[PDB]
Amino acid sequence: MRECISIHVGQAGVQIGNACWELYCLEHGIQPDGQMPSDKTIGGGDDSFNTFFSETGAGKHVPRAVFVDLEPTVVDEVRTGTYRQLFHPEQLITGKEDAANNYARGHYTIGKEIVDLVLDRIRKLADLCTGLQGFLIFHSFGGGTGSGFASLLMERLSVDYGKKSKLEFAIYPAPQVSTAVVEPYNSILTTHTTLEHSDCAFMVDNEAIYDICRRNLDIERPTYTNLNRLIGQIVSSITASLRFDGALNVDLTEFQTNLVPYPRIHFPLATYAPVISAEKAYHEQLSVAEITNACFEPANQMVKCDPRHGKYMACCMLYRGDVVPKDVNAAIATIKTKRTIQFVDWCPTGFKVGINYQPPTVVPGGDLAKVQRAVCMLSNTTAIAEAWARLDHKFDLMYAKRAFVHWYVGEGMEEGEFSEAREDLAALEKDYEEVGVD
Amino acid sequence: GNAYSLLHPSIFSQKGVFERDFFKTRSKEEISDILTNIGVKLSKEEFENVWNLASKKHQRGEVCVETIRNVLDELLHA
Amino acid sequence: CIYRKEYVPMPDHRPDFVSRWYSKSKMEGLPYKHLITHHQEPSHRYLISTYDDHYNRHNYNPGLPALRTWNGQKLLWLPEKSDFPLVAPPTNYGLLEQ
Amino acid sequence: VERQRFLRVLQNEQFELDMEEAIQKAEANKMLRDRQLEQEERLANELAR
Amino acid sequence: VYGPGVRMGNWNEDVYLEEERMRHFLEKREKGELLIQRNRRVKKNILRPMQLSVSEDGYVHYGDKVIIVNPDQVLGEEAGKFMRGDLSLCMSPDEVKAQLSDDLEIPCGVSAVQTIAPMGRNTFTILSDGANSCEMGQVVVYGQNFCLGIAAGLEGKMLYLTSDHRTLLKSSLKSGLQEVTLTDEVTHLNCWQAAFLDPQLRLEYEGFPVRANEKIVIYHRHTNRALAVHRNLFLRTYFGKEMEVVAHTYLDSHKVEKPKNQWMLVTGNP
Amino acid sequence: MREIVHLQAGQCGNQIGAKFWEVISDEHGIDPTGTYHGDSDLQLERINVYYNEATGGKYVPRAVLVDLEPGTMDSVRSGPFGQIFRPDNFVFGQSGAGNNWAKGHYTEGAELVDSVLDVVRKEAESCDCLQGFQLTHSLGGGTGSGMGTLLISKIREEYPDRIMNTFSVVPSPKVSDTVVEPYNATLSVHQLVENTDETYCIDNEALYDICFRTLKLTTPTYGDLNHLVSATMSGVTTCLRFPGQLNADLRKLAVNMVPFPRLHFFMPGFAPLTSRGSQQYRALTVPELTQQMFDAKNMMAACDPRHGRYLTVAAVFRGRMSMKEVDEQMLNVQNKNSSYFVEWIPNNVKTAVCDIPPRGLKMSATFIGNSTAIQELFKRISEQFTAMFRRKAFLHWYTGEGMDEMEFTEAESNMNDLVSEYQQYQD
Ligand SMILES: Nc1nc2c(ncn2[C@@H]2O[C@H](COP(=O)(O)OP(=O)(O)OP(=O)(O)O)[C@@H](O)[C@H]2O)c(=O)[nH]1
Numbered sequence A: 001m002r003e004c005i006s007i008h009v010g011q012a013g014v015q016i017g018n019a020c021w022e023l024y025c026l027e028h029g030i031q032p033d034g035q036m037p038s039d040k041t042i043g044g045g046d047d048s049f050n051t052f053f054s055e056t057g058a059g060k061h062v063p064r065a066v067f068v069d070l071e072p073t074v075v076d077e078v079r080t081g082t083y084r085q086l087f088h089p090e091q092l093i094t095g096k097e098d099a100a101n102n103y104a105r106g107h108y109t110i111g112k113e114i115v116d117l118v119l120d121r122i123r124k125l126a127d128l129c130t131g132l133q134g135f136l137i138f139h140s141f142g143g144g145t146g147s148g149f150a151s152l153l154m155e156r157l158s159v160d161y162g163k164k165s166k167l168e169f170a171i172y173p174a175p176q177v178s179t180a181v182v183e184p185y186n187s188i189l190t191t192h193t194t195l196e197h198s199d200c201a202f203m204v205d206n207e208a209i210y211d212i213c214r215r216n217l218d219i220e221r222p223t224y225t226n227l228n229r230l231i232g233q234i235v236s237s238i239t240a241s242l243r244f245d246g247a248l249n250v251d252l253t254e255f256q257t258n259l260v261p262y263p264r265i266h267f268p269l270a271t272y273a274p275v276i277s278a279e280k281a282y283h284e285q286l287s288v289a290e291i292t293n294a295c296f297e298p299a300n301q302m303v304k305c306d307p308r309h310g311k312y313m314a315c316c317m318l319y320r321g322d323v324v325p326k327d328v329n330a331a332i333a334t335i336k337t338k339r340t341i342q343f344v345d346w347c348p349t350g351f352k353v354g355i356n357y358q359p360p361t362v363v364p365g366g367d368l369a370k371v372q373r374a375v376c377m378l379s380n381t382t383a384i385a386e387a388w389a390r391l392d393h394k395f396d397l398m399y400a401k402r403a404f405v406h407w408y409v410g411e412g413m414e415e416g417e418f419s420e421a422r423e424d425l426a427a428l429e430k431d432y433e434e435v436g437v438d
Numbered sequence B: 001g002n003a004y005s006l007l008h009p010s011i012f013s014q015k016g017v018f019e020r021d022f023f024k025t026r027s028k029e030e031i032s033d034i035l036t037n038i039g040v041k042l043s044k045e046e047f048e049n050v051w052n053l054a055s056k057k058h059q060r061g062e063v064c065v066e067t068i069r070n071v072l073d074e075l076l077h078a
Numbered sequence C: 001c002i003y004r005k006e007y008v009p010m011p012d013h014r015p016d017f018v019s020r021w022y023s024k025s026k027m028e029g030l031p032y033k034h035l036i037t038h039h040q041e042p043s044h045r046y047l048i049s050t051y052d053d054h055y056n057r058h059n060y061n062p063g064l065p066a067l068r069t070w071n072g073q074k075l076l077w078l079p080e081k082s083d084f085p086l087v088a089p090p091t092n093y094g095l096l097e098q
Numbered sequence D: 001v002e003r004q005r006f007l008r009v010l011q012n013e014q015f016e017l018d019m020e021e022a023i024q025k026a027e028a029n030k031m032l033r034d035r036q037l038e039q040e041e042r043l044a045n046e047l048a049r
Numbered sequence E: 001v002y003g004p005g006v007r008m009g010n011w012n013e014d015v016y017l018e019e020e021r022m023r024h025f026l027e028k029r030e031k032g033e034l035l036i037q038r039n040r041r042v043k044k045n046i047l048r049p050m051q052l053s054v055s056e057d058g059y060v061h062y063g064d065k066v067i068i069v070n071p072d073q074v075l076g077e078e079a080g081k082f083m084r085g086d087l088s089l090c091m092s093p094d095e096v097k098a099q100l101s102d103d104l105e106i107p108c109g110v111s112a113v114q115t116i117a118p119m120g121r122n123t124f125t126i127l128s129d130g131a132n133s134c135e136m137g138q139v140v141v142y143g144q145n146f147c148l149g150i151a152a153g154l155e156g157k158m159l160y161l162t163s164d165h166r167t168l169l170k171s172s173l174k175s176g177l178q179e180v181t182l183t184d185e186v187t188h189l190n191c192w193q194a195a196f197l198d199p200q201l202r203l204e205y206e207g208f209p210v211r212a213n214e215k216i217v218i219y220h221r222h223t224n225r226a227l228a229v230h231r232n233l234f235l236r237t238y239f240g241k242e243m244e245v246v247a248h249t250y251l252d253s254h255k256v257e258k259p260k261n262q263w264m265l266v267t268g269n270p
Numbered sequence F: 001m002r003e004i005v006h007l008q009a010g011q012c013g014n015q016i017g018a019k020f021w022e023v024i025s026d027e028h029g030i031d032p033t034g035t036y037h038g039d040s041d042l043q044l045e046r047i048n049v050y051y052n053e054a055t056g057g058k059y060v061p062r063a064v065l066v067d068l069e070p071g072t073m074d075s076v077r078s079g080p081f082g083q084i085f086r087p088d089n090f091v092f093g094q095s096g097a098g099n100n101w102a103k104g105h106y107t108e109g110a111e112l113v114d115s116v117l118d119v120v121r122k123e124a125e126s127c128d129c130l131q132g133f134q135l136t137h138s139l140g141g142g143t144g145s146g147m148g149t150l151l152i153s154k155i156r157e158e159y160p161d162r163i164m165n166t167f168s169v170v171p172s173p174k175v176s177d178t179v180v181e182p183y184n185a186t187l188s189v190h191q192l193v194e195n196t197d198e199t200y201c202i203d204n205e206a207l208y209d210i211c212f213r214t215l216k217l218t219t220p221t222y223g224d225l226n227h228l229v230s231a232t233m234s235g236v237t238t239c240l241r242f243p244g245q246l247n248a249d250l251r252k253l254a255v256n257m258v259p260f261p262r263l264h265f266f267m268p269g270f271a272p273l274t275s276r277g278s279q280q281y282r283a284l285t286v287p288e289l290t291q292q293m294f295d296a297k298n299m300m301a302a303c304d305p306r307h308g309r310y311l312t313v314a315a316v317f318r319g320r321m322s323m324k325e326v327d328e329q330m331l332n333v334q335n336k337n338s339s340y341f342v343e344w345i346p347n348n349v350k351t352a353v354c355d356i357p358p359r360g361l362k363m364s365a366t367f368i369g370n371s372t373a374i375q376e377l378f379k380r381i382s383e384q385f386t387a388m389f390r391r392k393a394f395l396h397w398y399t400g401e402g403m404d405e406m407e408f409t410e411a412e413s414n415m416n417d418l419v420s421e422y423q424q425y426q427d
């Protein structure tokens, strides 16, 4: 049937993995114990949770996700949390050693003796599954342990399972903020390894996420509780079609086909329009028109790219809530009449609509608004090549003065693989330029 | 009163009845008959209990038109 | 710690469903299907067959025979038949009951 | 189960929604117009007296 | 940008359209035609609280109105979703057909609910087989044939518990076992026999009066099976969720019948 | 006797057939459960053209539902009339479509055509003698286009002596949602042209205009749009089931509309569409329908034939009419626009009168049109095809499935041949 398996690598992906599952248990009303009230939804494990949880004859909802980590601090502490009884113990893949921000350590030193264990989980997750459309991979480009460890496993799961989708979600490196100077090393290393195997990589940047917080949400001092909630809301919206129906139902398989124009480049951008404070929701109104302007307002994107410096290829709007096609089709028609939005002449139509009736609900102790009409805007534009153009001119400087190489060559690596990534990258911009040229 | 009460006065104010009449002094049994005359039927037990509470809330102890109607709504809400 | 602080659960947060049902109600208009396209006055039965009327039923009984004489706009023989019979059991032959 | 669940609530709600607004507004208007007018006149006329 | 009182021309036209329908749906339902009026009246009849017979001798007599209950038993090995408490049998009508007609489905389903309060849905009148000239008020005897009837809130028509040898067309919905139904027809399939709790003492207790409020085992005369209720199998019906009730004999390791077919005859409390 | 078996294809056809069948059922007075309430004899007589008889007075529809995604027919089954549809007729797949034309045409179709062919031939043996078949789907409807093109191909050699009625909706010209939609349409239409005999052309945008024009309710439901097309589809079928001096056979009609084999694409037309005042402000007369019947605004199928001219016109009139008003009207209309027809064929009108009105309105009609207004349709899809095929965008999927651009070569060339054919016949 309609199910998938979620993957969360590194401590960077664990607390977002917690938050998403924390969010998920709300709309289904999952008690932290693992069971409903005396009302009956338990059985052979088949209801709205069957696509997400495994609430078998034992009656306990088992999330179909894997948390893999290499440092026991956070994973053991969350194992002392509140929903830990829901979580499977050795599914909470813990580790005793770190990768020291190094891709190779997580890819070579320790990943060998750990991937066999997690593959045992995946196959034993696979056998009970029925359709398993694909996977949900949550990671980070600047992965202290997320980067290297994910890269090997995605190689391993691609080779044995090359007939199903693999969905990638990672925080894009901050273009001007660098919490690590080895971060560019592993980040481009991950990209060149993943371009030929990753199906759909979705990125986001936290700086603009904060920028939203004190612009319209009016929060000058948020936390991960909010940040994880926003992205957890984002993945919830895309998975609402899996949970609920609508006027038309859409799936990740359609998303892949209708979003990626050509091979290699599979990196669109996501944006959520109704981002507003509860009071700013209270004394104003939400409708398709203004939110369409908002989601198409250049400053509402979480990635630092000016759409007027690029051009648009694909756009997907996922209207979750109470909407009618009449105003939507008229509103998007007005958008097509807009001159500033520059689609490429190659695509006359580039709009993928997914209508879902279900209103996006609030979360207890949350900061979101009371939304009746919401949309997730997935788009791909040429204004992103600057990010890799930003990456390389940092990288080329450091490479010539070959900083920190003694660390990497000391642990057994060499210059060739580093050399490979740049023309792999240099291929990307020229392809981006060539596709940019009509 | 303010121009708001002059430009938008209650129905009382068009024809010459005002707040001093509300706050003025009158007697127990007379208003009970008047309350029947104004079309509200009452019981004796309700009369005295209302009378007890009204004197308490007034902080002095008396009968005023506002006091009588206000405690009615209090009981009506109660 | 704030990590445990946001883990503090709370009851009475009931994930309802009613917004489903209103939104669903808006995407079909269930009773409207016989209400969108109904025309003129409601009528439970109106049907009858032309052969039955002209041949079997011998046409409209309550009609006045000489309902045709000098009229208004067309000051001549007119008001005879544009209405046509509609009444009486149309679908009541013996083979149905058997 | 979902089908049978679907039926009543759709029929149910429309019933109560229709009838409740039918009564609520109907009465809510009437006694207010009644009570405010009837009380004022009878109380205020004797105030003159 | 509109809606409350704008009285705009299209808003003018729209508000009418539904309104005559609101009148139209009004008069249709003002005739006592509303579905939930049907449901409430049927529920009103079904949920009518009854008055049970009170046994003065401690025994049971024909014509008595009793509630049949499977008592709560402390079983520590039924792993799964087991339902605690005393379970009383209750007729389970079909939800869809109950909406279409005020008359109960000619055959009716059976169920057991965690309810002890006397009511039309769980009150059963014990009756003779008809073939035996047993008078009303006569004590019931072990090994005798008889019928379990329920007046399901309907004046003049009487429902009798039924069961037949399981076929491929007639079986329990969940377990695929011999189903139990309620029919107004009087057949030999309506013959039932209460058995003493101890199988090793049934022959000793044959021909004896049956005491009030005690553990017994009931058997279908025509099929010779004990009435079974599944405290782990949930059925969804018109009032919510209850437990499956079938006719099958479950024996323990010692060939002794399980807690499942142990049934309580519940008489009125004086 | 002569009967029809229906096929429900594509995910639109799922909402199409659900609305279309209930339109038939309530018209024939059967309760949602299925126990017919005997009130009308002629519908009780002529129910065997579409419905067969189960036990206890239940009229089993002779339709087959096919899809891939469980949720759709589950919603259809959970509809008010799902109980009148058969789980036997619920054939489907265990795969998500991807809404790829080739997968449903080569990959997913392979393992499902066997079962569906068994179902239809069992249904074919269930009934005696068919006029033919009709299909509800979309030309731009990915899973429907993939299955339909396969099934219409196979049923051709199966029964090349029947009626291959087709009912497909044209996607919105301004936006197709699906970006590979013009590929799917071009793929489908290349198979449609040679395999079909009848085709209804329907577009959603014109329906939205009708919503704005006469419906005037701002926000309809897609089911209301389903209700409109089903009413039009019902009207043409009223000929067969109902008596009255009108020759009902589509073959009667088909030879009357079709001068040349390539003419398969036809546009519908419907009769009184009524607004708020006009349910009680309309003097219902045969004249006043006609200008509304012959209203470019009333036209709903593709576009205005004002840009072109009229090849064949055929309208079926439902209600208590007579031979003369349609006659003098037919005289009136040809007088109004004599040159707008073709000197090729005079007297290009084919009229039928159904004496049995519908339930709710008395004097109604339906129209089917074959005018020279389809050029805008496939000329539009032509530039779209040339645009993407210029740089073969979104092509790697079909090659991964096993398709090539070299197949696309004749599909447009066949389509280009149709461009001249419609042009040359008229211009
Ligand atoms: N995804 C995610 N990133 C965070 C969070 N908080 C801070 N970050 C940023 O995400 C990055 C985490 O990447 P890494 O340090 O490589 O994580 P890792 O590979 O799992 O291994 P560690 O070095 O032990 O953290 C840090 O550089 C932070 O700047 C969070 O909650 N989630």
Ligand SMILES: Nc1nc2c(ncn2[C@@H]2O[C@H](COP(=O)(O)OP(=O)(O)OP(=O)(O)O)[C@@H](O)[C@H]2O)c(=O)[nH]1
Pocket: A247, A248, F009, F010, F011, F012, F013, F014, F015, F097, F099, F100, F137, F138, F140, F141, F142, F143, F144, F145, F146, F177, F178, F222
């Ligand atoms: N059922 C339905 N279909 C719609 C609606 N609006 C537009 N459509 C179109 O009708 C077409 C026909 O559906 P199908 O033939 O079943 O399409 P499919 O093969 O499942 O795959 P897609 O065409 O890509 O959706 C779809 O492609 C939709 O684009 C609607 O409101 N309901």
